[PDB]
Every structure is written in structure tokens, then in C-alpha cells.
Amino acid sequence: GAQVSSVIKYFNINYYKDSASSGLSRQDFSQDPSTLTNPALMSPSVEACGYSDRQITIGNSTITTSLHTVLAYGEWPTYLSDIDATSVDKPTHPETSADRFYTLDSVEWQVGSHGWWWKLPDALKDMGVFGQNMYYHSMGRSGFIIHTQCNATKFHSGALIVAVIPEHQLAYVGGVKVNVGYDHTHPGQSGHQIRGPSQSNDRSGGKPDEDPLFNCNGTLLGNITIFPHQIINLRTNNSSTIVVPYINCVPMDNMLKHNNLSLVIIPLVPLRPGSSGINSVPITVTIAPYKSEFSGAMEAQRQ
């Protein structure tokens, strides 16, 4: 035919001469024989590979905290290099001017606050010379570093879930068949405050789902731990850091149309004041583009 170039041998044969005509895929061996965990999942500690790449400072802005950084999918961000790239055109590397920590508007964390989410790169579209390079380039890829920091006292209580969901596709707020609007899934830096669930939530213009339990996409919380995440417990730690590489099928995508990440912050346990009289605490998010690349320069896609 063809072939190709308790233990059972077999003659490898393609009867139809082709790959992909072949049957199902097993694990071969050349000689006789005679795995349990995947550390890439489970969100390693960024020391669980190496710490030489990291006191955290990218591009003229400083973070002082880094054994508790989670390295998403155990992969460190890196430039597209070659041989994985489509175009031969040399990408632009802004480096320290567009790779830096951008701190967003703080959000009050109250009793009854259901959650918040930010889409990335979208949140950064107006931020600095990163947000300029989005519009003037066809494509782009970036890794990010999300530093989420919420400080209360020893009298306060309550926990957050800080998760980064690749390709978080929102559900429409209910009923009929509608695509969520371009504007409601691209909120800007302000992100989206989850105000639901209720039967009274407005349904118009494709508004996204407001239910935090189903992750707005229809999958439970508590399974949200399969993504890169940290749990901020005000009894233990006040802050969070997550290092995400560039996750996508494509080497570079548009960055205006496609949001390849989501930063979701869910008050897993509510905020209870202690003997203190403080009913709400700010949550602040600081995003650093890291190892960002841009190609296909044009006129600003800005309207």
C-alpha cells in the first residue's frame, strides 16, 4: 500500500496512499515498551519555569510586589520569531514606550457588586502609544501582564476571583437570536460592570449577559479556575499578577475587531466590613502590554 516515513506491534500502513486518510492516532514506539499531570494548566507560579525574566518593571514603570505571579499556560511571552509567522514583513516592536503598565479607572467594590470585566487589547485602545499603534497597523500581537490590586484592612473580609479567559464570547442578554453589539463588547477602559441577573435587565442592541454565575457565556463559576486565575482573599493577599502569552490560532490579528482575552473579576464572597465602617474598597487594574508586535501599517483605522 503506502506506509509513511499487553503490547501489540502493528505494521503501519496507509491503504489509501495519503495522510489524513489514515485512521485514528495512537502513540507509536520504535521498539517494545518493556503523564499524569499537566503543569502548563493549573497556572504555574512563574518560578515554576524560570524567574530570571521576573520588583517588576516593564518599560519605565515599576511594580514592587513575584513568586505569586501566575504564568498563564506555563509559557512566557515572546515575539513571534519566524517560521510560525505568515507575512515576511518585519513587524514593529515599540518596546518600552508601548510596553508599560497602564493603570485603569478604579472600581468600587461594594456589598452586592456582582463583578466586572475588561476586554483586551480593547481596554488599552486609548492608552498611550500602545493605543496609537493599534489604529495605524493592520495586525498585531501582544502578551499582557495583569496586576490586580485591592487593599483592605484586617477587619474586612471577602474574596475575588481574578481570571483571564481566552476568547470569552458573551451571551446575549436573553430571548431571541441576536449578536451582542460591537459597542457593548468593546467598552473601553471602563470595562463592564455586571449588573445582573434579573428578568428586568434591558434587552436591546445586543447587550451582553449580566449573569456572573454562568460567566455571561453559560458556564458555571468555580469551573472558571480552568483558566489562568488568582483568588484574592482579603485575609491573605491584597494583590494579583498574571502573565499571559499571546493566545490565538493566527500569528497576528486585527486588535480592533478581535479581543483575544478577557479580564474577569468576580466577588466570589461578598465584601463585609468588620468593626470598621468602610463599606466599599477600590479595585485597581494595571495592564502592561508585553512583547507586542505590529505590522501592516496604514492610515489610522480610527473612524
Give the torsion through C-alpha atoms of 191, 182, 288, 102, to 10 deg. Answer: -50
Least Å distance between CB 139 and a second copy?
12
Of 186, 171, 75, nearest to 121 by C-alpha is 186
Under rule CB under 8 A, how many of the chain's residues touch other proteins? 42
Spell out where the chain has E strands.
56-58, 61-63, 70-71, 102-103, 107-109, 116-120, 137-149, 157-166, 192-193, 229-233, 239-244, 261-272, 281-297
User: Binding to other proteins by residue 59, rule CB under 8 A?
Assistant: no
User: Binding to other proteins by residue 64, rule CB under 8 A?
Assistant: yes
Q: Considering beta carbons, is residue 122 or 293 the nearer one to a second copy? A: 293
The 10 Å Cβ neighbour count of residue 80 is: 17
Which residues touch 253 (CB under 8 Å, ≥6 apart)? 139, 140, 141, 260
The amino acid occupying position 59 is: G
Using a 10 angstrom Cβ sphere, with 0-12 exposed, 13-18 middle and 19 or more buried, the burial of residue 148 is buried
From 12, 60, 78, 169, residue interacting with other proteins (rule: CB under 8 A): 60
All three cell numbers of 94: 515599540
Q: Which does 103 bind (CB under 5 to 8 A by kind): a second copy, other proteins, none?
A: other proteins
Task: Please check whether residue 240 is in contact with residue 230, taking contact to mean a CB–CB distance below 8 angstroms.
Answer: yes
From 18, 89, 167, 202, residue interacting with other proteins (rule: CB under 8 A): 89
User: Binding to a second copy by residue 126, rule CB under 8 A?
Assistant: no
Task: Please check whether residue 125 is in contact with residue 192, taking contact to mean a CB–CB distance below 8 angstroms.
Answer: no
Contact flags string 25-64 toward a second copy, x per CB under 8 A? -----------------------------------x----
Task: Please check whether residue 150 is in contact with residue 144, taking contact to mean a CB–CB distance below 8 angstroms.
Answer: no
User: Binding to other proteins by residue 102, rule CB under 8 A?
Assistant: yes
Stretch that binds a second copy, among 11-19, 35-43, 88-96, 223-231 (CB under 8 A): 88-96
| Residues in region 233-262 near other proteins by CB under 8 A | 238, 250-254, 256-257
> Which residues of the shown chain bind other proteins in the complex (CB under 8 A)?
60-65, 86-89, 101-103, 105, 127-128, 136, 138-139, 149, 151-155, 189, 238, 250-254, 256-257, 284, 286, 295-299, 301
Binding site for a second copy (CB under 8 A): 60, 89-90, 92-97, 100, 128-129, 132-133, 136-137, 294, 297
